[PDB]
């Protein structure tokens, strides 16, 4: 189980839910993609243990005094909790997923929405599709400092990667195993900054850039124009 051939990407593109409204107070869910679940992890915690143990269950860890020993039942079970009971799912669905988020599901959803271990994914989706997309604007006054530099990047290299796409059932095995840097295979994650220590393709570019300075300086002084004419003076002598 890796790819169902239409595996929807997280898609952070910003299309807001119908009743999301002012982002449901926006700023309340303009929180980092885990701070979003941070409220979930206390909400979903509350969705048990005086939500169903208040009426119809027994999960508080008994002790020598006939009492909940642990503060709450083992939160591991809370995370992987299968609400296989229809209404007892709804009774824990009218609280956290539909209480606050207004994330109306489809029959398909609630059919897949079996355990909150999976339903966390569902609530992560809509907020992420409600996550307003970045406004990629550049003040032109800032561009002319970019659009004037002598040094510009090449910006065509990703296409020079060794193409790997095939049946991707074995594109996940490489994770649990140590095999993705095997036999010349290598994953490529584009970055912005490199380690300046020991990167022989970084330092080698510095002593190329730091030479482009000593040259460029020698155009300002007006000598490259002198020795470019020193040759011609020695070229037209006869």
């Amino acid at each position: 189980n890796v790819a169902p051939a239409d595996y929807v990407p997280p898609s952070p593109r910003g299309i807001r839910p119908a009743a999301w409204d002012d982002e449901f107070a926006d700023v309340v869910l303009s929180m980092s993609d885990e701070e979003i679940q941070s409220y979930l992890l206390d909400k979903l915690t509350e969705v048990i243990f005086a939500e169903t143990q208040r009426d119809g269950y027994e999960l508080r860890r008994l002790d020598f005094e006939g009492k909940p020993l642990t503060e709450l039942p083992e939160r591991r079970i809370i995370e992987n909790f299968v609400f296989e009971e229809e209404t007892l799912r709804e009774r824990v669905l009218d609280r956290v997923v539909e209480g606050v988020f207004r994330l109306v599901p489809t029959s398909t959803d609630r059919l897949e929405l079996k355990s909150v271990a999976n339903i966390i994914d569902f609530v992560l989706t809509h907020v992420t599709v409600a996550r307003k997309p970045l406004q990629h604007e550049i003040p032109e006054a800032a561009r002319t400092v970019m659009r004037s530099h002598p040094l510009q990047p090449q910006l065509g290299f990703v296409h020079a990667l060794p193409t790997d796409n095939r049946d991707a059932v074995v594109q996940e095995w490489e994770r649990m195993h140590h095999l993705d840097w095997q036999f010349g295979k290598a994953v490529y994650e584009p970055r912005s900054a490199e380690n300046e220590r020991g990167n022989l393709t970084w330092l080698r570019e510095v002593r190329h850039h730091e030479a482009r300075e000593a040259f460029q300086a020698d155009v300002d002084s007006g000598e490259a124009r002198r020795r470019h004419m020193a040759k011609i003076k020695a070229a037209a002598q006869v």
Binding site: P4, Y7, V8, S11, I15, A18, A19, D55, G56, E85, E86, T87, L88, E90, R91, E98, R102, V104, P105, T106, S107, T108, D109, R110, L111, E112, D121, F122, T125, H126, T128, V129, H178
Partner: protein, 398 residues
């Protein structure tokens, strides 16, 4: 400076985001494709197989965000096909479509040079046997036993397995009467309006006997004890029963009349009616003193139609068992379920544009957005009704 002890570092150690397609249509035509070639047939794909759930996908596709679903220009279609997607479903057709565009029941007899008559399959001309055999018995005087009225959801309701239309040529259908039919019988009956005419009633779903049970507040698993004030109202009703004509103290547990069990709820949760009836103890007053709570029963009932017909068939089955009065859904007649759905869609095409609130009552998705849009006070009680419908199954769940 860095410290390395050494002998260290040991170098080697699917939910779809439901987006409205209005933002996707670059033009006008490719929208009409998504409307018809992607959603209309999806209604016809249910209008043929089982319209009992045609109102469930509506809530689902509304989550994905299409605009004009509940608007009539689907119901003006759905209500049409959900009748004749039976007319040909009982001729014998299995797949409703001959291609993407046309209907399986419209590929005419001649390849394309025909006007009105349709090429039948051996399933048809063998499913038209039980029709024409039902005709002879309808003229014989004996019981016109329509074998395809014993059919239902999981087949023949009688615990009997159902034979298939291309019957083996060595097992001809045993006829206890003796009226034999064969290919020469169903030969001349081929054109639609020359076959719609002969045996209309036997195929027409009977919506008249179930014209409306939907504009009347009903309940699934509620009794006379069923209440949130399990001490205030249920004992007040004793004070309503000892005070009623022909009084009996509230010493029994037999549910009150259906239409009045919701009247408990207008006075159960609303702590205004829980004291506006908290002082008055007559039986005549608890049903009469609330005109307002009865002038807005439509806004109370409709929300019990939509919300209980959206989420899962396990509700829509239950809901078709609550209203139309079934024991189970699986052991049911085919035509009457076509009736039960008809009335569910006869009203859905008036509930939208008539009732201004009903329009956004159905286009909406969340429970809250309807309250903020539609009648809130009619919902504070309706939410309680919904809070109570499961509170009796909850003990049955324990």
């Amino acid at each position: 400076v860095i410290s390395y002890k050494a002998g260290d570092y040991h170098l080697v150690p699917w939910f779809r985001p439901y987006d409205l397609q209005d933002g996707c249509f670059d033009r006008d035509h490719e929208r009409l494709s998504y409307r018809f070639y992607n959603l209309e047939t999806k209604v016809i794909w249910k209008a043929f197989d089982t319209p009992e759930l045609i109102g469930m996908l509506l809530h689902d596709e509304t989550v994905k965000g299409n605009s004009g679903m509940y608007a009539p220009d689907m119901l003006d279609a759905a209500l049409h096909y959900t009748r004749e997607a039976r007319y040909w479903r009982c001729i014998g057709i299995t797949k409703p479509f001959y291609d993407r565009n046309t209907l399986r029941a419209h590929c005419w007899e001649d390849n394309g040079l025909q006007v009105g008559t349709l090429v039948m399959s051996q399933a048809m001309r063998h499913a038209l046997m039980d029709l024409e055999r039902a005709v002879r018995r309808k003229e014989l005087g004996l019981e016109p036993n329509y074998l395809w009225d014993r059919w239902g959801p999981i087949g023949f309701i009688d615990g009997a397995r159902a034979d298939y239309l291309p019957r083996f040529e060595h097992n001809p259908y045993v006829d206890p009467d003796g009226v034999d039919v064969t290919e020469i019988d169903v030969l001349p009956f081929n054109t639609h309006e020359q076959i719609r005419e002969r045996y209309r009633d036997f195929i027409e779903p009977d919506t008249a006997p179930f014209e409306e049970v939907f504009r009347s507040p009903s309940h699934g698993s509620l009794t006379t004890l069923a209440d949130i004030p399990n001490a205030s109202v249920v004992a007040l009703y004793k004070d309503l029963k000892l005070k009623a004509g022909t009084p009996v103290a509230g010493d029994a547990v037999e549910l009150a009349p259906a239409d009045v069990r919701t009247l408990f709820y207008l006075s159960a949760n609303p702590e205004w009616r829980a004291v506006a009836d908290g002082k008055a103890s007559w039986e005549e007053v608890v049903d009469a003193m609330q005109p307002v709570q009865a002038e807005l029963d439509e806004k109370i009932d409709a929300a019990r139609l939509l919300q209980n017909t959206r989420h899962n068939a396990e509700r829509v089955r239950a809901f078709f068992e609550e209203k139309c009065g079934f024991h189970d859904f699986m052991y049911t007649p085919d035509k009457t379920i076509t009736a039960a759905v008809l009335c569910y869609l006869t009203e859905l095409r008036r509930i939208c544009t008539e009732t201004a609130w009903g329009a956004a009552l159905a286009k909406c998705l969340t429970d809250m957005e309807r309250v903020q849009g539609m009648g809130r006070d009619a919902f504070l009680v309706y939410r309680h009704i919904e809070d109570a419908i499961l509170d009796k199954k909850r003990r049955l769940w324990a």
